Every structure is written in C-alpha cells, then in structure tokens.
Amino acid sequence: LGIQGEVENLLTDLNYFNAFLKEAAKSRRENEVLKELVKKIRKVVNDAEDSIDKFVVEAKRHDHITHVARAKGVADEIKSIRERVKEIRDNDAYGLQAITLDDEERKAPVVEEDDVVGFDDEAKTVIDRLIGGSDYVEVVPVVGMPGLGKTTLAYKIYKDPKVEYEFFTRVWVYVSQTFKRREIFLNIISKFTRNTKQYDDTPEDDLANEVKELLGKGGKYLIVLDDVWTMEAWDRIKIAFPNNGKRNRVLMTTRQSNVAKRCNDKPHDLKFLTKDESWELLEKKVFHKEKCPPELELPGISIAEKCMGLPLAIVVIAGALIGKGKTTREWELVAASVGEHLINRDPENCKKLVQMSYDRLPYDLKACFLYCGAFPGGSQIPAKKLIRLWIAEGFIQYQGPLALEDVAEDHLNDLVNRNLVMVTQRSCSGQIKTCRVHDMLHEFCRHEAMMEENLFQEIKQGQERSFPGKQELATYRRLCIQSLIPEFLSMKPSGEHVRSFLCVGSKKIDMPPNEIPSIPKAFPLLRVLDAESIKFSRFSREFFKLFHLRYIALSTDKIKTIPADFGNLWNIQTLIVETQQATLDIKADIWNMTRLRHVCTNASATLPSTKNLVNRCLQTLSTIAPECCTAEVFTRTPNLKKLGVRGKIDALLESSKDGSGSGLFSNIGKLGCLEYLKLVNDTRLSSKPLHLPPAYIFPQKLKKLSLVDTWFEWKDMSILGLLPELEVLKLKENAFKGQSWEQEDGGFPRLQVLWIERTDLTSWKASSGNFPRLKHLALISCDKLEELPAELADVKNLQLIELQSSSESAARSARAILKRNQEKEQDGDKGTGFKLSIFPHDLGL
Template identity: 45%
Template sequence: MADIPALAILLGNMMETISYNTDLIGRAMSNDLKGLCDDLAVLKASIKHYPEWQKDKGAIKNLENEIRDVVFEAENAIDTYILHASNQRHRGFLARAFHTTESASVLRSLGKRIAQVRAQVQNIQRSDLPSIGLDALQFDEISYMRTKKQTPLFGADKVIGFVDSAKDVIELLTGRSQRQSDQLEVISIVGMPGIGKTTLARKVLSDPMIDYEFFTKVFVHVSQDWERKDVFLSILTSFTRIDEAMNRMSDDALADEVRQRLKYKYLIVIDDLWSNDAWDKLKSAFPDNKKGSRVLITTRNVAVAHYANTKNEPYYLGFLSPEESRELLRYKVFDGNNCPEELQAYEAKILDRCAGLPLAIVVVAGILRNNSKATHWWMSVAENVHDYVAKNDELGNDVIRRSYNHLPYNLKPCFLYFGVFPEYFEIPAWKLIRLWISEGFIEHQRFMNMEDVAEFYLQELVDRSLVMIGQKRSDGRIKTCRMNNMLQDFCKKQAVEENIFREIKRFDESTSAPYSSSHNARRLCIHPHNLEHIKVKPTGDYVRSFLSFAKEQIQLPQEHISFIPKAFKLLKVLDIGSIIFSRFPAEFFYLLLLKYIAISCHFKVFPGKLSTLLNLQTIIIDTSLRALEIKADIWKMPQLRHLHTNCSTSIPKGNWAFVGD
C-alpha cells in the first residue's frame, strides 16, 4: 500500500508551479490560487506524518486516493492553462487577438476547476487530520542532514562473508590443487534469490589470484529480461569504446567480434542466467582457445547449471554461518562496531529468523540503522521478523516491503524512481540527482541547496542497504550507483500502484497495447529495444516524463520523434539519450513546461530558440562531435541550474548571476 506522506511532495510541487507562474495565470485568478495554496499548505502539514496516528489501513488507502485525485486534477488544470497562456504570449499581435475569446474561455474553465478542487481540499481538511508545524519539522530534518552528512558510511564497499565459498570457487576456476585443464570449462554457482550469488562472483573476480591467472576478466549481467545484442556489447565495452558502427552490427557479427577479442586466457562471469535458451544464444561467443579459459555462471536454476556443464556438479551456495551473519548485521548497523550488550538478545533473535540469508540481513539492517540504539525498536523488529523472513522465493518482496514502509516520506519516490533504469544499469549519481530535482522529488530546504539535499537522500538509501555504490569519487562521494534486481522489481511494481511511472517492456506491433495503460500515467519509461515502435505514436494527456536509458544508441527517422510534443504536451522531463538526432527537433520548442532535457546528437549548433523554454533547469547534450556552439542565451533562462556537454562548448557571453540558485 502506498504511503500518504509521499503525497506531500506532490502538493509542494503544485504550490511551486503556482508560485512560479502567477504572472501567466493572471490577476483574475490570483485570489483563488492564493487560497488554494493556503489550503494545500495546511493539508500538506497535516499529512506529513499521517501514519504515526492513523492505524486504519482502509482509511489510509481511501484518503490517499482522494488526495492524489485532487492534486492530479489541480495540477492538470493549472499546467494546461499555463501551457495555453505561454503559447498565447508567444503569438504575434494578430494571432493573440484572434485567440482572445479562446483564452477567456480557458481561463473561466480553470476558475471552475480550481473552485471544485478547493471545495474538495477543504472537505478533506474538515476530517480529523492533526495539524503539524512545517517549519519545525523542516528545521529538524536539516539539522539531521547536516549532522549525518559529516559521517559517511564506513567501508561501504566491503564484502562480508563468503570467505570459504570464495576459496572453493577460485579452486574450481584455477585448479590449483589438481592438474588444470587447458580446455574451456563452465563453472556454475547455484543458489536461491537473495543468497549472495552476485556478491560471491564479484568477490571472486576481484581476488588477486584471479588477476594473476586470467589475462582478461569480464562481468556481465543477463537476468530474465535480456537481449543478446546488449550482452555482447557489454562484453565489448571491456575492450573498446562502442561506436555507431558496432551498434548497427547484427547479433551474430557482435558474437564474432567478441570471439576475436578473447585471444588470451579469459574469465567471463555471466550473472543471473535464467534459461537453457539464453546459454545456447551466448555460448558461441566464447571460444575454446586452449589456454585454460573459464566461464563462471550464477543462476537460481539447477537445471540451467547442469545444461551448461553436463560433466561437473555446480557449486551450491549455502547460507551464511552464524558468525558471518552477525558480522554482516553489525557492519551494516554499527559500521563494524560491537552491538551494545542490552541489544544482543534481540540481535540473536533477528539473526536466527533471518536464517543466514544475506538479503534478509542487509535489508533488516537498513530498518535498524537509524534507530540503532533504541531498545524498543530492536524488540519490535525482532518480534516481527518471522512474519516476513522465510526460506522461500517470497522472502525478497516481504523484506523489501517492510523496509520500504519504514522509509521517510521524502525518500519513497526517490527509491521507487530507480525502477526507471534498465537492470544492472550503472547510474551516474550526478544525473540521478538532476532527475530527482526536475521530477520534483527534492523539497526546498531553507539552509541547503537542492543538490546537497538530493545527495543526502542518495546516501540515506545507501546507508539503508537499498542502493549499492558502484564507484566513488576521489573525495569519497558517490560517483555511480546501482540496485539489486529484486529491489528494482519491487520498485517497478510499487511505482505502478502509486502512479509514479509505468514501464513499457514488450510490444505487439499489431496493437498499441503497451500504451493503453499510459492514459493516466505521469511518467513513461521505454526499453531501448522497443524504441523502434515509437512509430505507433503513443499518447498520454497527463504524461510529465518520457525516459529511455540504454547502453547502446539508435537513430530514428525524424517523423517518428516529432510526435512527442503532440502526444505529451505537458512534458517536464525528457531523457532520450538513447536516440541520436541529426538536428534539434523544432517541435521540442512547444514543450514550454520542460524542466529537463537530455539528448544525443550529431549537430554542431544548439539553436537560439532554446532560451524560450524558461522552465528549463537541466540541459544535457551528448554529441559525437568535438565542438558544440550553443546559440541560446542561457543567461536569460532564470531557472537553469546545469548545462552538461561532453565536448568543447561555446556559449554567449552573459551575466553569471542569471544561472543556478
């Protein structure tokens, strides 16, 4: 069930939109909008800590749906009018005169809709919601963030446990205790979901003995939803930069390219292999070069392991020992320090019920971490662990849901947003932070800029063991991050329930079925291998974000791209870096509400008309050329915070005071 406090962010975003665009809406609406803002501020303060007193889950669900409908209705009405008013402002004198009657009609319609929304909000206020002061709450949050930010998570990259298992697998790969075969061999690690197969494989791959034995080492994820081409391209990134020519190659040609690169003794780790068919489609790329090369597979399916290697038994990964379990829990909760004596009885009870399953221990540790010294909290978790920890496939979702339910309201949409990225995608932290801000997930704080708040949120999710650090910067800050596939699956399902986003995965060319559910969606993310089906031209009256992330890029005819402004008129976030543009689509200038745009291109000049998009906060341009000229007068774009390019860029001279906060 969704949590009502997350709706406080929606309310805050709408109030911000009204504040930024009062001049466009006009004086006639100023009093009604001010009244609506006041009503929403009271409602926002009231629901911020709603679950602390409301125990009736049915009442929570009903109230949640009512508030969401009210906020979405108001947001749709206001954004639609702002778009209309912006278009009217950009028209010439005669065109404005011609559309005067239409504008008056739209304004009257907005007035009626706002009056209806105010009545609904006031009706909600008359319920028994308690009133909570916003200023004090925000100050407490900021103080906590400042304190927490100075104490980064200790040893975030350390791997706990699997010492004996790592030795066993390394022995299987190197054959140190017996004569090693020069022929290509396949070794499999088998275990249930959440038991640590991927962690063990990474630990093995980073071992010095493996460095010594194998000239080439590659780690590649497959998972249930995979594409043969993506796997081969991922392997090739270990050898070379993927260019446009490679992106256009067929699967078989890429397999041949991989074979040619694997000349010396190699170790390929194929993580999360689900089926025999997947192995059949991949194995041709791995040559037997008679140098003792190995392929290491992780899978939850014993049959797949036996199919990949009929001669040898797979390695069955067991549960953590009691000592390893205790070390892992203390590492995650106390940064490796000892557990206080008064909590050790509860610690033992929790570990007993986690039954040595790493995922259970890690996620439960995330629940305990921010109340690490509170005896009553440990008692509560210890008593309830048995409700959601068991040795079966349902474990993951049960544990993750409990951890999700204990997240603060402001972290929930940020956590669920990880579901928009492809599985095992290495996410640049800077880009994630820009997206969170543009999506409206980061609230304004009185003494911190939004980027610092977002970075704190990310560190919080890492500290709660819900997000993994990929790489760190030289100053210790997070450079890239990723998410466990079980957690990401939860994010995708929960996001649909809360209308955070919808994912378009598969497509039937004879219908537009994947888009049929997008009518009420606020955000759409589309898998890269479905981009070719954009020619169906989906529509979504209320879509605010259109996202597509991929390791490879494709080039689509211009006519299949121009539909975006027509189909998604209220778009605020557009990240389609997986599509290459030969010119900047002129149709994008109609997206007057746009806050964030990320595109890939082959053109040399970024047009001056871009400066008419006054709501833009972030511009990201990835070009294949060495230089880019930006003709847009970015200094006249009052909300622009970030401009990212991957090449030498010239911009108009201006006053720096116009940029940033």
C-alpha cells in the same frame, strides 16, 4: 483577473490534501477505504498541480486570441478540479476523520538453523574478529540489505562450538523498529533469575545497573543485538553492558551502515550467495533431501540466477515453485515472471521485510528511492545523472547554504547507508560514481511506483501487455520506455499528463526523421526528457513549446547549433547535447535561464552574447571554446565549480602583447568556486608548444586538473606544484612531451591522485617532498619508463601503482620495493597495506 484568485483557493486546498497524503503515508493501516481515498486525493492533487503549472506558464507567456482561448481552457480545467475537490469533502468526510484523529509485533523472526548454505566462510571471518580485538567492549556489526541473511548468520555465529566455548555468557537480544528499553533489560534479567516480578517499582536506570551486575559476575559476554535501527537505540542499550576489561563482545546486525560505523569504523558487509550457492539453496528448499529432476535442472538454475544471490528471494520463489507444481513448462513460466512472485503474489514474507526500510524513509527519500526503479533491472545508474534527475523532478527541496547537487548527493549517500542502493563504482576522491539497485528492491520499487503511488509507468510490448491505449495514457504520470521507441511513437500517442519521458535503454537508436517531433507533440507538459539514448538529426519547433522542460539530454550526429528558439524554455536546469560533431554553437539565450545549472557537451561549445543579471545557479559549463572564456562570461557565472576547455587553447595561454595582462586564462582565475578544470587541445601546428601561465594566475581553490594533448614540457610540472589545494591530476596521451621528468623541492602540498597515459616518459627523478598525500599513481601504457624512484617507497600514503606489459626493469624495481617493504614489515615497521596486481598470471609469475 479572478482566475488567479481561484488558483489561490485551489492552492489552499492543495496544502490540506498534500498534508493528508503525508500523514496517511506515515502509517500503513489495514483500512481499505482510506487506501482508496488516498489514491483518489492523490490523483486530484496531481491533476491540480498540472493545471496550476499550465496557468503559471500561460501567465508568464502573456506577461492574443489564442492566449485568450487557452486562458479560458485553463479556467475551465481549474473549475473542474475545484468541483472535484468539493466531491472529496462532501462524500469522504469520514475518510478525513480517520486521519485527523489518532489512535504482538515484537515476536523475533524465524531463521533456519540447519541447512545453512554459503555462510561457513563469513561466520569464520566474524568469529576470528570476535575472538581477537582489544580488551574493552568491541562491537562487530554485520550489515547488509533486507533479506540478506544477517540474522541467519548471527544465529549461526551464536551457536558455533568455538563461540559457545570461548564466551562465559552469551545473550540474544531482539531490538526492532520500535522497542521498549525496559522490556529488553527485564528479558536479560529473566535469563539469570526468573523472579522478574520484583522489579515493578525499579526504574530502568537501576535495571541497567542490575544487568551490569549480572553480566559482570564472570568473564566475556557476547550479546547479539539483533536488528538495531538507530544510533540512539545502541546508546540506550549499551549502558547495560559493563566494561571490566575482559574482551567483551557485541554482535550487531543492522541494515544501516552509518549505525554500524559508529559502533565500529570497520563494518562487516555481508556477502551475497554465489550462483552455485543460490542454486544449492533453491534445490534444498523446494526438493528437500531429494535431488532435482534432470528436466527441471535447467530452469532451476535460471531462476536461481534471477535472485542475484539473495536468500530471501530464493526462499520466496521456493514457495512459488512448490505451489505451481513440478513441470518444466511451469518452471520456465516462473523464470519469465520472477518479479511477480516476489512482490505481487507473495506479500506475506518478502514485501513486508522490504517495507520495513521503506516506511522508515523520510517523505522526500521515498520518491527518491522509487525513482531508482525506473532504470532497467541490473543496469548501472550514473550518480550525476541520477542526482540531476531528482532535482529536475523536484524531489530535492532545499533552502540552506549548500548546493542542490550536494544535498541530493547526501540523499544518495543516505540510501546507500541504508543498504537500499548499491554502489558499484567510486571516483578518485571517493564520491559515488555509479550505483545499482538490487533486483528485489527494483521489483518493489516498480510495484510501489506503478500500482500504489503511480510515480511512473513503463511502456513495453510483451506477450499480453501491448502499447497502452488513450484511456491508460490519460492516467500515466511518468513514462519509462526502454526499446521500440519509434514503434511506440508512430501510433501518435496522446499523453496530456506525462511529466517525464525516460529513455532508459542502453544502445543508442536513430530516431526516424518523420517521428522526431512526436515526443513534444504527445506530451506538452513534459518536465524531463531523458533522450540521451536517441540520436536526433534535427530540432523541431514542437520541442520549443515544452515550456515546462527542466532536464533535457539528447544525442545527435547532425545538429551543429542549438537554435535561438531553444531559449524559450526558461525552466531548463540541465542541458546535455552529446554531439559527435567537432563544434557546437549555442545560439539559445541560455543567460535568460535563471535556473540553469548544468551545460554539458562533448564539442567545443560556443556561448552566446551575455548582453546586471547573474546566473547564480550555474555549476557546470563543461567543454567550451577558449575564445568564450572571457572575464564577462565568468562574471555572469560566479558559482561555477567545473570548467572545461576544448580546441585551440593557444588562444587561452597566449600573452596579450598589446601591453596588458588580460590573457583569457587569467579570467579563469577569477572564479572562486572552481574545483575541477579540464583542458583539451586540438591544434598541434604551433611553432612552439604552449607553456603554463604562472601559478598565481590559476584558481587557488582548484582541487582537480585534467589536460589532453597539451604537449606541456615536463619542466612546467613543478609550477603545478604551487597550486595549494590540488588533489587530483590526470593526463591523457601527449598531454606532456619529453622523456626526462624532474621535480623541485616541495610542491604538490595536497596531491592525492595522479594519472598518466601513453606519454613519452623514459627517465623519472623526484623527491620525497612532492608526495605528502599521494594515494593513487597510475602510468597506463607508459611502458617506456625504466625504473620507479626509490622515494616512492618512502611515501606512507601511497596505495596502489598498477602497470601491465611494462619493461623488465620496471618489474624488477617493483619486485625490489615489494621485497624490501615485506622485510621492513617483518622488522616491526607498520604496514601500509600496499598491493601490486599483475594480470594475467602468465607474465610476472
């Protein structure tokens, strides 16, 4: 009875300590004693929320001798945490004093003027943009990740003969993280007149008016607003910039793309140095004018590739190579530990610049960004996998109307807009699909999340860092293992405080049958199990004891059914079982999972019986059996946004001949939140191919459709045109049958992307009314098509049609469209930026 009351006492202390950590993280002071206090309080907080979560699952399980013993153990653990809390207040009273109370840096950064390598083309691109443009004040924001070379390029642009000649007056302004607008205006005034003493009683409003007058005395002005960090900072400074219609220019450098977009909707994203240019800079910085010795040339290019074309990393390793001497063996040692020299051993130049973006991040985005360093360097992170991981870890806290996936996706967008995370792939609609963190930021993430905040720790067997012992595992919070998983698991590890187990490897490995239950046995408090890179031959009773599990992903080639004991994990949000079997049968009580959000699988999932309660948090059901698409199942899931059907879908589209209209496909139309629908066929031996139900049966809010092997006749594509909100339609091979494709007038009112693969299409007739918003139209391996309709050339929104090894007639039609469009553009028609790509150049050229 009183144990729950003691949990309230500990929780009250935890609110104070969590606020202490949040306030301490807002100011990175030089006080080392507070650095050790925050680390000690953080460890107690982490050990406290683990004990509280143990108490929560114990109370849920209870509402018997083993339960009594476990309750006594939890009470003893809570007592130890409470006693540890008292020691913090008894001994570290002064440390708490420094944070509950409250309380040179404006020197412009140094960037090399000479020996600038690889910016000749980028400078010319920006210069040609500054000279041209409209007649009012235009901003040309160069934007990139920390250390990219924005200020080096901006100073190069600031000093070319063409920029100096064209502009009447050019002014360099150093905005920073924190600045005073009064000082900026007085510095600009100081350049025109030296008597700045006379403005002591002049307000900033009349200072900006004075800067207006000074800049307006002549022609064009180029003002290099360096290191602008906020939308507001640009607004407060632009009031000093006159607009007299003389093609005045502003050259802004910033790490923020969203700030760049406001100034100009076409930000100039700075490029990274190539492998040749990266090596050129390294040899120019280490060996100065003298060339690199031949023995050191081979290791030198290796370390240049390690920087991934970032000038800041090249400059940092240049100092490391100078200090380490000039020997072949030392240079090869550096190439094996490049990350150490960037952050661990050189905090003076590189680490501070990285921390400028990091300490500005909101408190929730800090753990989100550090989590991106768990994945291996240079690896590609799926965006949907990353988002679900953030939600499972608890980094996304939200109570508004949006879904947690949309909030976490906004967090990913914020990181990308801050140039802390790269985007490598984008979906058809423009949503981020795959992202990757740069190398320098990955090492900073690992340094911050292992040696400062203990977010996660990696497991590897290097030259000296073998597998950690029991003492090290007693402090490890999150585990990130890439390879040698069975070898690590064979030693019977004992991590009682492990909250995550991320198998971040790429190649799948088969877990030995005798080591399958080792993951649940080692870490009873596992909250995330990212074992999608591990193939499991069987489930174990130890897996069903991970009551704290929220994210579980696992591959398998043998398991056909998810057992009923799997439903004992009521905390699970994401359930991924990537199986190579034809069918998967979920016997688990997934309906009891009140917080279930995603169920993903490659097989035909057979859902259990629903037998009031509603799964409000379920967003994705992915591929399920057609017979389970009942109106009762869809009743329990009102917020479903993605649905997939796999198998014999003739049980979905069949007419209920008993007299009613209750076909299983009609139940799908009752889902109001559905946005993406998938159908995959397996059975081809039907006497007649299936035909689509009427369009009013389809979900009206559907915005994407995908069909596989459905053998639909081309005549029933016009009914898909009656879908009001459809935007993406994709079809794989044999999804549509026939050679003649005809369309009615109108239809497809909002279609934007169309995808076809390996169909029997040979003749195609359409009309201009079917493509009011189409942008992408690919016909992969549809080499049997004769010619594209002439109405496609009239589609303004069309962007790209890509075909390889197509017919000669198709190539001729593409040539005619390109030639006629070019002639029309030469006659004053506005260009749509349409492009055609042919690979390789041997054919078609």
